[PDB]
Structure formats: C-alpha cells, structure tokens
RNA sequence: CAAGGAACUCUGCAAAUUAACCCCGUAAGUUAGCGAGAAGGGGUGCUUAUGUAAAAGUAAGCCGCAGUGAAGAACGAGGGG
RNA sequence: AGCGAAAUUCCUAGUCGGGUAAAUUCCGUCCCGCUUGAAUGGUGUAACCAUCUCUUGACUGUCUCGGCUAUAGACUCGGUG
RNA sequence: ACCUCGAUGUCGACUCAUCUCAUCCUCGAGCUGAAGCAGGUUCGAAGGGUUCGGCUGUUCGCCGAUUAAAGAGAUACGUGAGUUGGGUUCAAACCGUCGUGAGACAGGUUGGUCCCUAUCUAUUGUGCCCGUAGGAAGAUUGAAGAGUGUUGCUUCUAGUACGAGAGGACCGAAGCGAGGACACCUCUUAUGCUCCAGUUGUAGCGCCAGCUGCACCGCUGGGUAGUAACGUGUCUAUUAGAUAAACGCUGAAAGCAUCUAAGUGUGAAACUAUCUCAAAGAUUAAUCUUCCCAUUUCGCAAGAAAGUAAGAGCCGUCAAAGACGAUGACGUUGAUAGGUUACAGGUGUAAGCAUAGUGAUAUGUUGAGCUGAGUAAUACUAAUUGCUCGAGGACU
C-alpha cells in the first residue's frame, strides 16, 4: 500500500483534466438587476416577484 | 473507533424538528438547510391540520411537539395558533406553507432555504 | 422455434390455492394489448423478428421521430419500442390477447429486471463465505481471504481478467424458465404466473415460450370457496 | 397506465369468505378439517386458542394450538383453504392481539371468558 | 438449522430417554434435519431398566421439530420440541405404545405399523 | 437474532444464562478455621386493613406477559500436578 | 528410603482399566526407571491461586449462517490540509 | 553455492481456489479364468464433483461414521501491502541431562507482538472528451465472448432376460433426493432506532389525570413498509454436426483375405453450435427506420447575422434509481415529490364522561384511538414570469 516512485507532472495534468466545476443555471431577474440562478432567490433581496429578503 | 462526536441521531433530528416548528409557530418564517426545511414542512402541515380540529386532546397531542420560549410560552403559543393561525387554512387541503431557496451557507455551502406561510 | 411473448409489469405477488388442497404462489402482472410497430421478415430485414410499440402516451408527450413513424404505420403514441426475435404470427398494428398467445396450464419463461442494489460486495453477489470473529481475528472478518495468484520472481504476479468481485448488482434483466402460467383476465388486461418473478414496482416483464417446454401443457388445478354465511 | 394495485383483491374476490367470526387471538375455537383418504372423508377437530393473526386479505394466517398427550401442537391455517370448517366456541376479553406467552403455559387455569 | 450431535428425545417406551443425531442419513453435506427425516443417531441416555443401553449407534425417525416447517398446503405445522422414535432395523417399532402426535405425510414412506399405535395422526 | 447449543477453533479467545433483597437448604473431607454464598431451589408490584418507631412482617383483594419490572450485578461441578 | 512413561521415559500412537461410535489430548495401573529419587530435599498433603490442565452442566451468532437497524468513518460538498 | 542475504516473510489452520491427467467418481467403449448380480483389465475422456467429526500446532498421520466415489501432483510444499501466532526460532521460569561453568540439548513444559493512508500495471462496476463519416432518436444482426454443461435413491415394465435352482439384469418412464447458482418477496423467521403500545423511577410540565427529558430504542409485548434468509420457485436439458477410444460396411494391398488407401457410416457428459446473458472503441467504429435542417447575401457559404425547428444539457420535484456519476418519470396546459382527503394495515376498545367500587380495579361511550414507508383522487406548496448547446452537408 506504498508507492515505489513519484508522480510525473504531465500524467498529473492528464489526471487533473477531469477537474471541472458544474454549470450554474442562468435566470432573468425582472424587477431588479443581476440576472439570478434557477431555483434561487433573485438578486434584489427577493425571490423574484416577492420581496422578503435582505443581504445583511 | 474510539470516542468521538455522535453527529446526528434520529432522536436528535426529531428534537431539532420540534425546536424549529416551535420557532416557526412563534414567528411564521424559518431560514434553515433545504433538507431540514423540507423535512419539517410535512410535520408542520400535519400539526396545522390537527390544530384546525380545535380539540383539547389535539392540544395535548401538539404539546409533545413544541419547545417553550420566553416570548411565546406553550400555552400562549398554542392559544395564538388556535386563534389566528388555524382558521385561515380550513378551505385549503394541505400546502399551507412554501419553501424558497436562499443562497448557500458560508461555512459549509449548505443549501439554505426559507420556509414561510402561504394560503 | 416460433416465439410467443407479451409485455407486462409485476404489480404484486400473492398466493392462490388449488384443488387437492395445496397452494400456489402467484405473481400478478398487468398486461396490455400491444400495437405492433413492425414485423421484420427474413426477406425484408434479413431476419424474422417483431418490433412492438407499447406503453401508450399522449402525442404531445411524444417525440417527433416517434410520431412520424407512428403515423407512417398509423399507430398510437407509445413509449417503448422493443424487438422480439423469431416472431411471425402477427402483423403491423394488431392488438394482442393472452389467450391467443398462451394456454391456461402450459410452461413459459419470463425475462424480468432484477432489484437494483447499486454497489454490492462480492459476498452477496456470488454468495461467498465470511470468516469468523472468534479465537482472534483482528479487523478482517468479512474480507477477501486469499487473493495471491503468483509469488516469487515471476509466477503470475497479476489479477487475471473478470475476477469475481464487487460492483453493480441488480437493475438488470435475467430470465427464469419452466414457470407455470396460471390464468388471464382480458377485461382488465392482467395475468397470473407461478414461482418467483423479478422486478420492482414499474418493472419490465417479458413473457415468452419456454425453450425446454415448447408446447407441453399440464392440468393446473383450481380451488374455489363456496362457504359463506 | 392508470393503476390502483387493487387488482390484488380483485382476483382475490373469488376466494374471500364472509362467515369468519370475529377472532384474532384469545378466543377458544375448534376447527373441523376434512381429510380425504382417497375416500371416506374423515373429520379432524383441532381445538384451542389462536395465538397470531398475521397477513393481509387472502394472506391472513392464524395459528391454532392444541395440547394433546402433553405435547403442544401448533398449526398455521389460512382462511380460504378448502376442506376446512371454522367455528367459534367461546371468547373472552382481549387486551392485546398478538400473544406468545400462551405457547408455554400449563393447565389447571381456565382462561378468562366473558358471557 | 441443526447442529452436529444435536440432542433429542424419544416418544415411546423403548427403554431410552436421550439420543443425539450423529449423522444425517443419505448423501452428506445435506445439512438438513427436518420432520420425517430418518437419521443415524447415537443413544446418549437409555435406562438400564429398559431394553436398550447408551452409546450404541442406530437409526431413528424424527417426529417433532422445535422449528417445524412450512407445508405445500400453505399450512405451517410447528412443534415446540425435538424428539424421535426408534425403529428396530425395519419399518416396525420397538415401543409397545407410541406417545405423542405424528404426521400423516409419511404414509408413502411406510411406517404404517406405527401410525395406528400413535395416540393420533395429523 | 430463530433452530440447534463448542458441532469453528489446540483451546467456551470473545459474547453469553446467574447475581441485588428475603425464605430455605446444603454433601464429602477436614489440620475444626473451613468447606460453602456449597450444590440445589423458591418468593420480591399495587391497593385495603393489621402491624411498631418507621417498617421488616401477616392476611384479604387488583392488574400485568412479566413486579432487583428501567441503571449495577456470583457462572457451576468433578480430577490431577 | 519413597515414588514413578511421571512437565523428567528414546522404545510410545508404553501396556491395561475408564472416557472416547471417533481422544500422538486426559485420569489411575505394571515397574529395566537409557539420566525417577531423599535439604539440588523424596513422598503425599487441608483451603487457595488474574497457576498448567482435562471431563462436564446452564448458557449462547465461536460453527450452520449471515443478515438487519442505528450512528461514526467512508461517499458527495465548502474550507484547511 | 547459480541470480538474491543495504532482507529473497518462510510451518500450520481457515478463505480463493485454479490448473493437469499419469481419471477417483459420473460417462462411452474393448477384452476376460465376464451365467446374472457382482466384477477385473484397458483406451478415450477435465463437462461436473470428489463428506464430516475426535486427537496431536498440524497439511502428515491414527480412528470413527458416511457418499456414485469420499483421487493424486503443482502454484515461495500459493495465498500475513487476508486473518491466527497455535507448536516451531523471543526474552521469563522450570523439569531430566550434559558440561566444574559461562550455557546448551536436532529433549520437553509454562505462557509470550504480527506495522502499513494503493503511486503504477492489472482487475470489478463505473461515468467523462472524441468519433463512428450532414445532426439526433432509436431498432438492432452478431465478428468476437461469459455462464451452465453435477449426480444418486425407490417403484413399473421385472423376480423378467440371465441363471436352474438359488440369486439376479440391460433401456426408458414416474416419484423421491443431495448439491450449488440465479430470482423472489405472498407463506415462515430475523431486523424493522421519528409505527402501535403496557410501561417503573427520577427530574419537570404550579398539582391530579395525562404527558415530556434520561435511565439500551429506559424495560418489556408486538409490528406497517422496507431489507435480508432459516421461508419459496427454475435449473441439472434436448437436438443436429464434428467426433475420441471403439464398433463398422464395400474394397484393394498380397485376385483370397481385408473398418483404409479412395469412399461410405455409427459412436463419449470431452468439442461445435442448439440453452441463458451482454455485446459494433467489433477502427471492419457494421446494418436498418424515422425525425430535423438547407432562410437574401461575402473567402471551399468556408457561420454570414438567425446557428435545429429534432432533441439534449444546466436547475428543480423526485426513487423505481441512487457511493458520486449514471437510469428513468415529471416539470405549471405540470399529476413529479411532498401536503390534504378517502381506503388499507397492524397496534389494539384512545382520552374524557358515566356506572360499580372504600380499593387496587372492572364495563358502556368504542374494534374504538393511532400510525416512517402500503393503495389511490385533489393541484394545496414546491418542480419559475429561466439560460445554453443543438441545422445549411463536410467529398463523390
């Protein structure tokens, strides 16, 4: 359960080729700016049509 | 292994649910983790339906799912619920509340969501 | 040989008595009259088979290629299209009934999907044996045991292909043969089978003619209760 | 597409019987059983009190215990098996349905029965 | 299941009181000892006042099983004890009288001589 | 965790029946102290009254599937060195 | 002297008697006891041993025969690393 | 005395077992000092299998019982980046001896560790980028594979052929079996830790009732869904061909004779397929069907701005799926999950009241009360007034 050698740079880069972040959805914010993310509160301290949030 | 923290247990989760439903009954809005909110929503709907019957035995039943608060004691909060919360939801079958996703938690990126009232 | 089959879903399992006072376990499968998408002749598609379209849905719940080839053959909007080899008895767009496919007491086989266990150890996967926990065993109690292939400078020093290991289990289709057909219900599109049928709720079940028992039919007995008061 | 899973009882309708008296356990009943020795149908009476009534619909099973020659005989029976005759001799008061503290008791103790 | 050298009792006046299954008759690895099985046994205890003694090896037919078994009728005949009856190298018994209930499903397997001597047959 | 009940294993490693209170009882040998808590067993709740200082205790009734009802509980016998 | 295949004995898988359907384990028996054996003490010795050991009861997931649930880890994710 | 002692984990037990036949059984067959039964010898033959206990550390070995039979040789007499440390090679102490003694005994006893986060090849399932010949959806055939390809007992023909008598068959069929694999959740068990309970004490709910916290999930009695099996169901093929050993026919060698030289066959569980399952990265990137596009005009129109209209990805409801990925259904005209309601299910007549009671208590109100998950209708809440990729045929 031990390594006999080290890991090369380029094989490590090929290993890290899979490193990628998921794509976050894009949704239009009508009443305010900064178009939001789908199934999230809108930008403007509000879900989208209903305001009940603050950025404190 | 050796000694450690027990993390979360079913009794611990149900006690947390009791505390959170007590808080939401005191206020009407709770911001928590998505999983906790969606888990507590079903029990909240059950409690609302049981309270809309307006029976003292139902008060005894709901006693075992509430945690006391200085602002709203058990009797005070129960009376408030039976007075102005219960009658509003007789016409609607279920679905007395809505959960809306907030932003993620700073510490652990937990999906925060706010559960609040609707008709 | 010529293959007679039908599609259905296991909606439960129960037991039904028979004559001479013995019971028969019963798997109940909902069936449906399939609408034949096409029959592929050896002079038409180089080998005889039948592609059946079933699990009807709405046209707005249907893909454009699907509706295009359904209207090409003047079919109904359905969900699944599956091919059964060696099928010549019927033609395109024909509703099917179980009585014309199978008899009341013959033997047929059923292909059904297994219960998906996800990641499963090789212990349950091949019914292996687990070590003890007495007289001193340490951490390994449910362990691989011996896995050495070759020692020394070069004897095997490798794990060969396809060793019986852990991995995907269930969620795949197997076939069980020599199961006695019990009865049909055309009014409600239902069928009863004996033995043990794989498949969870909403699973896939395909009844075909038994290879070992092509046309042998046995006199299955029945029990009816007329004792009410 | 439209399913109910009530077909389980729909096919079961042809086997259900309604004569069955109210009994789950704690009731002393005798069961007459018809046995064909290829002829000359004999009647075997297997008396006793029911211990368990588990199952659903046609799957309901009830266990009857007798005590003959000192040996206790426990046999599970189905509702809708043919060649069986059921009845109710006497019943008592039921505080709990499932019982297993009776599969070991001795005699000289008349079980509690109501009028 | 059933252990090796599982102890069990007698059900008739054969001069014995305690016996132990030393081998299940037939092809080994069957590791199944249910009702109606005729198995090789060794007499753990036999009263000297009786006709048999301890230690001897013979073959006995089990009559009751504390686990019981499920039947193809759908009925589940279960007993609360494990015991057997002893045969004298034949289908005839040794005890003048046979005590305890017996099953009727061994009719095709002979032993009809003992069935009438038993107190009752299921 | 059923059924066995040491059949796995050199090997009851480990788990595991028992204990707490009361009523009993207890073999052989003994260097008279033991052995021995031998072994082996049985009983333990509530209510009513009687109990004395409370009770230990007694009787009557009431329930349970259970009454050291939940926390802590003695493993045993024989032999040789 | 006493004692003895004895932790001491190669012959041995000693002999025999018992256990054991089944015992290179065990208890006593005979004494050529290769080197038992008398303050290196010989012989037994009552009770006891976190002493070695055998047979054995109750009891059991050590075995048939593993599986189930709970958490913790793992797995996934943000941070540290 | 050969690479290797700046280490080549070695005894035994369990587990993986695998391979091979110089085959033990099952099988085909030849011959016999082979009446039958029961045999013996021999060739082919690895498809499959070849028992459990007591003893010694023990594979060795002994014994007992049992099966169609209870094979043998190999892998560091395989298997400690699997377990045990059991005797054997720990210190400790001792027995007998040896040696005047440091200690030793290829004699013995008492006991006495078993460290390790997987870098690479490889392997199991598993997704990701590309591409399969304009772009997708599927339907696939199957080049090439995997699994299985065990076997006994009772009865009938049969006390029959055989044999003489006595004794006792050959085939097939029926039933009974053992074994293991796969699948299953209705019968049966086990779990069933947000199900139903009786439930003691303590501390609280200002007290009673009735509850909560903790005492293992307090204890104990059960148990829905679910999970498993100790529960249930299938399996032990058949067929065609090539055939081994072997048995042949015709037929020459060598006019006879002759299974062989040509030819013509039968024939083994071994082999090919017939059986079960997957499968085109199967670069030979295979085949088919449908769908969508060809929207002025500018380099091969080569994106020129519209870059699919087919559909898919991001996001969510989700669980049948689910390590995570992936599979699948649904996304407001939405029946996807949750909620509500109705039903079931079991737990087991709920509290309160009334009656009776001096009191533990008993009955009626009531098979009532309840229920994580079983069955289904209602949009009641969330699945958004959302985004992206996704075609102008590369060449004939």
Swiss-Prot record, chain A:
One GO MF term on file is: structural constituent of ribosome
Q: Where is it found, in Gene Ontology cellular component terms? A: large ribosomal subunit
The UniProt entry, under Pfam families, shows: Ribosomal_L32p
Keyword field: Ribonucleoprotein, Ribosomal protein
SUPFAM superfamilies recorded: Zn-binding ribosomal proteins
Location of region: Disordered: 1-20
The entry assigns this protein to a family as follows: Belongs to the bacterial ribosomal protein bL32 family.
Report the protein name in the record. Large ribosomal subunit protein bL32
Curated annotation (Swiss-Prot), chain B:
Q: Name one GO cellular component term.
A: cytosolic large ribosomal subunit
InterPro entries per the record?
A: Ribosomal_bL17, Ribosomal_bL17_CS, Ribosomal_bL17_sf
What Gene Ontology molecular function terms does this protein carry?
structural constituent of ribosome
Q: Which SUPFAM superfamilies match?
A: Prokaryotic ribosomal protein L17
Q: Which key words are in the record?
A: Ribonucleoprotein, Ribosomal protein
Isomerase as a keyword?
no
| Family matches, as Pfam families | Ribosomal_L17
Superkingdom classification of source: Bacteria
One Gene Ontology biological process: translation
Q: How does it associate, per the subunit comment?
A: Part of the 50S ribosomal subunit. Contacts protein L32.
Q: Which family does it belong to?
A: Belongs to the bacterial ribosomal protein bL17 family.
What's the protein here called? Large ribosomal subunit protein bL17
Q: Which organism is it from?
A: Mycoplasma pneumoniae (strain ATCC 29342 / M129 / Subtype 1)
Swiss-Prot record, chain C:
Q: Which GO terms describe its cellular component?
A: cytosolic large ribosomal subunit
Q: What's an example of a GO molecular-function annotation for this chain?
A: structural constituent of ribosome
The protein's UniProt keywords, in alphabetical order, are: Ribonucleoprotein, Ribosomal protein, RNA-binding, rRNA-binding
Q: Name one GO biological process term.
A: translation
Tree of life domain: Bacteria
The UniProt function text for this chain reads:
One of the primary rRNA binding proteins, it binds directly near the 3'-end of the 23S rRNA, where it nucleates assembly of the 50S subunit.
Q: Which family does it belong to?
A: Belongs to the universal ribosomal protein uL3 family.
Q: How does it assemble?
A: Part of the 50S ribosomal subunit. Forms a cluster with proteins L14 and L19.
The name on file for this protein is Large ribosomal subunit protein uL3
Name of the gene encoding the protein in the UniProt record: rplC
The shown residues of the full protein are 1 to 229 of 287
Curated annotation (Swiss-Prot), chain D:
Which NCBIfam families does its entry note? Answer: rplS_bact (TIGR01024)
List the molecular function annotations (GO) for this entry: structural constituent of ribosome
Entry keyword Metal-binding: no
Organism the protein comes from: Mycoplasma pneumoniae (strain ATCC 29342 / M129 / Subtype 1) (Mycoplasmoides pneumoniae)
Q: Which domain of life is it from?
A: Bacteria
Which is a Gene Ontology cellular component entry for this protein?
cytosolic large ribosomal subunit
Task: Summarize the protein's role.
Answer: This protein is located at the 30S-50S ribosomal subunit interface and may play a role in the structure and function of the aminoacyl-tRNA binding site.
Q: What is this protein called?
A: Large ribosomal subunit protein bL19
Keyword hit for tRNA-binding: no
Key words of the record: Ribonucleoprotein, Ribosomal protein
Q: Which family does it belong to?
A: Belongs to the bacterial ribosomal protein bL19 family.
Show the HAMAP family listed in the entry.
Ribosomal_bL19
By its UniProt entry, which InterPro entries does this protein fall under? Ribosomal_bL19, Ribosomal_bL19_CS, Ribosomal_bL19_sf, Translation_prot_SH3-like_sf
Q: A biological process (GO) annotation for this entry?
A: translation
**Pfam families the UniProt entry points to:** Ribosomal_L19
């Amino acid at each position: 359960a031990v390594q006999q050698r080290r890991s090369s740079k380029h094989r490590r880069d090929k290993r890290r080729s899979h490193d990628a972040l998921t794509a976050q959805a894009l949704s239009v914010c009508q009443k305010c700016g900064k178009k939001k993310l789908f199934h999230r509160v809108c930008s403007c301290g509000m879900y989208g049509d209903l305001r009940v949030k603050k950025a404190y | 292994s050796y000694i450690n923290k027990p993390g979360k247990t079913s009794a611990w989760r149900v006690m947390t649910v009791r505390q959170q439903v007590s808080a939401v009954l005191a206020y009407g809005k709770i911001e928590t983790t998505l999983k906790k909110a969606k888990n507590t929503q079903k029990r909240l709907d059950k409690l609302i339906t049981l309270a809309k019957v307006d029976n003292f035995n139902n008060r005894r039943q709901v006693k075992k799912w509430l945690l006391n608060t200085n602002l709203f004691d058990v009797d005070q909060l129960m009376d408030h619920l039976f007075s102005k919360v219960a009658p509003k939801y007789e016409k609607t079958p279920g679905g007395y509340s809505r959960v809306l996703k907030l932003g993620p938690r700073r510490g652990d990126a937990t999906e925060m969501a706010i559960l609040q009232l609707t008709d | 040989m010529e293959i007679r089959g039908i599609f259905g879903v296991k909606v439960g399992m129960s037991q039904v008595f028979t004559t001479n006072n013995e019971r028969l376990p019963i798997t109940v499968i909902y069936c449906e009259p399939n609408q034949v998408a096409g029959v592929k002749t050896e002079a038409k598609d180089k080998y005889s088979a039948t592609l059946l379209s079933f699990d009807t849905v709405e046209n707005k719940k249907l893909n454009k290629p699907q509706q295009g080839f359904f209207e090409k053959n003047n079919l109904k909007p359905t969900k699944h299209l599956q091919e059964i080899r060696n099928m010549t008895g019927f033609e395109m767009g024909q509703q099917i009934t179980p009585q014309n496919l199978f008899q009341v007491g013959e033997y047929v086989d059923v292909s059904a999907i297994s219960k998906g266990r996800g990641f499963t150890g090789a212990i349950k996967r091949w019914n292996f044996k687990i070590g003890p926990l007495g007289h001193g065993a340490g951490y390994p109690h449910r362990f691989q045991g011996s896995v050495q292939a070759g020692r020394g400078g070069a004897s095997a020093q490798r794990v060969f292909k396809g060793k019986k290991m852990s991995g995907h289990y269930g969620h795949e289709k197997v076939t069980v043969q020599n199961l006695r057909i019990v009865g049909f219900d055309e009014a409600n599109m239902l069928v009863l089978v004996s033995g043990a049928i794989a498949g969870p709720e909403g699973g896939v079940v395909l009844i075909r003619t038994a290879k070992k028992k092509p046309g042998v039919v046995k006199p299955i007995e029945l029990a009816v209760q007329t004792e009410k008061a | 597409k439209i399913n109910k899973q009530a077909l389980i009882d729909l096919v079961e309708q042809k086997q259900l019987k309604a004569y069955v008296p109210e009994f789950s356990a704690g009731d002393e009943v005798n069961v007459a059983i018809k046995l064909k020795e290829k002829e000359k149908v004999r009647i075997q009476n297997f008396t006793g009190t029911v211990l368990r009534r588990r199952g659903k619909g046609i799957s309901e099973t009830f266990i009857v215990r007798k005590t003959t020659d000192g040996i206790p005989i426990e046999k599970n029976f189905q509702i809708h098996n043919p060649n069986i005759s059921i009845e109710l001799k006497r019943r008592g008061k039921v505080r709990r349905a499932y019982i297993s503290y009776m599969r070991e008791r001795s005699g000289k103790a008349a079980k509690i029965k109501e009028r | 299941m059933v252990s090796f050298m599982t102890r069990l009792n007698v059900a008739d006046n054969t001069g014995a009181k305690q016996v132990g299954i030393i081998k299940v008759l037939g092809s080994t690895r069957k590791r199944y000892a249910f009702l109606g099985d005729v198995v090789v046994v060794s007499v753990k205890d036999a009263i000297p006042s009786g006709m048999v003694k301890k230690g001897q090896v013979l073959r006995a037919v089990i009559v009751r099983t504390k686990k019981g078994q499920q039947r193809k009728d759908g009925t589940h005949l279960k007993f609360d004890d494990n015991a057997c009856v002893l045969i004298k190298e034949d289908k005839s018994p040794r005890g003048t009288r046979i005590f305890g209930p017996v099953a009727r499903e061994l009719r095709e397997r002979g032993y009809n001589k003992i069935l009438s001597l038993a107190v009752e047959v299921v």
